[PDB]
Amino acid sequence: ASKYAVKLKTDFDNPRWIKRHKHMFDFLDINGNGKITLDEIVSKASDDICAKLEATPEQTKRHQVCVEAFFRGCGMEYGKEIAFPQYLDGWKQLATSELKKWARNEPTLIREWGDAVFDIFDKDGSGTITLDEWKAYGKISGISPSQEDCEATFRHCDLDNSGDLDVDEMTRQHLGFWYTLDPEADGLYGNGVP
Numbered sequence: 001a002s003k004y005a006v007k008l009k010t011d012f013d014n015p016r017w018i019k020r021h022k023h024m025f026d027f028l029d030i031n032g033n034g035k036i037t038l039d040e041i042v043s044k045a046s047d048d049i050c051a052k053l054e055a056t057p058e059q060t061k062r063h064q065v066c067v068e069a070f071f072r073g074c075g076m077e078y079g080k081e082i083a084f085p086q087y088l089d090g091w092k093q094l095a096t097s098e099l100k101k102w103a104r105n106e107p108t109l110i111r112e113w114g115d116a117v118f119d120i121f122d123k124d125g126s127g128t129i130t131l132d133e134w135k136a137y138g139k140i141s142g143i144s145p146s147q148e149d150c151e152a153t154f155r156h157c158d159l160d161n162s163g164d165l166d167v168d169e170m171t172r173q174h175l176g177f178w179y180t181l182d183p184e185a186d187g188l189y190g191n192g193v194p
């Protein structure tokens with residue numbers, strides 16, 4: 001099954017990797033000082049997104065704890081200001097480590113994060129995401145506020161064409177965008193992220 005088939009390794013010191021994370025870095029650098037902190041990342045990637053999605057307090061805590069683990073895996077910490085090259089070093093370590101974990105059947109940070117987001121999207125608790133529950137990632141995060149190709153990204157996430165999404169599909173498309181830079185996932189976050 002495509003949703004469980006992931007590359008064993010990736011390449012990192014290329015223009016697509018660098019530009020993708022640069023656009024995210026600049027967006028998450030709330031105070032614009034050229035350094036990113038875990039405070040800034042959690043504010044944008046967890047506080048604002050869970051508020052927009054009307055997550056419950058338990059869902060929001062869970063989500064935040066997953067975001068913190070994930071970015072601690074990149075070398076982030078509260079109050080620690082990190083410049084873009086060291087941020088990139090961290091993401092290289094994280095992606096390398098996580099792809100090895102996947103191939104060895106060890107739990108990954110990205111899959112746990114997927115679980116937390118999936119639970120929030122699955123408003124009726126059905127165990128799948130239907131098109132009416134789906135959202136444009138670029139729009140809910142604010143980095144591409146004009147993104148409206150929800151149905152196209154939904155269809156591409158739906159690897160088995162069941163007409164709905166499971167958590168493994170959502171996680172596979174997310175990992176495709178951020179670890180392995182799969183061309184099929186390009187555009188997932190709208191025009192604000194190359």
Ligand SMILES: O=C(Cc1ccc(O)cc1)Nc1ncc(-c2ccc(O)cc2)nc1Cc1ccccc1
Nearest residue numbers: 021024025044045113114117137141143170171174
């Ligand atoms: O995209 C999401 C939500 C999500 C969806 C599916 C899934 O399986 C897991 C998570 N979160 C996300 N996932 C990844 C990253 C992320 C990636 C790269 C990077 O350098 C920084 C943050 N950020 C974010 C939040 C965010 C903040 C700001 C603008 C857009 C999105």
Ligand SMILES: [Ca+2]
Nearest residue numbers: 029031033035
């Ligand atoms: Ca900053």
Ligand SMILES: [Ca+2]
Nearest residue numbers: 122126128129
């Ligand atoms: Ca549902």
Ligand SMILES: [Ca+2]
Nearest residue numbers: 158162164165
């Ligand atoms: Ca499906």
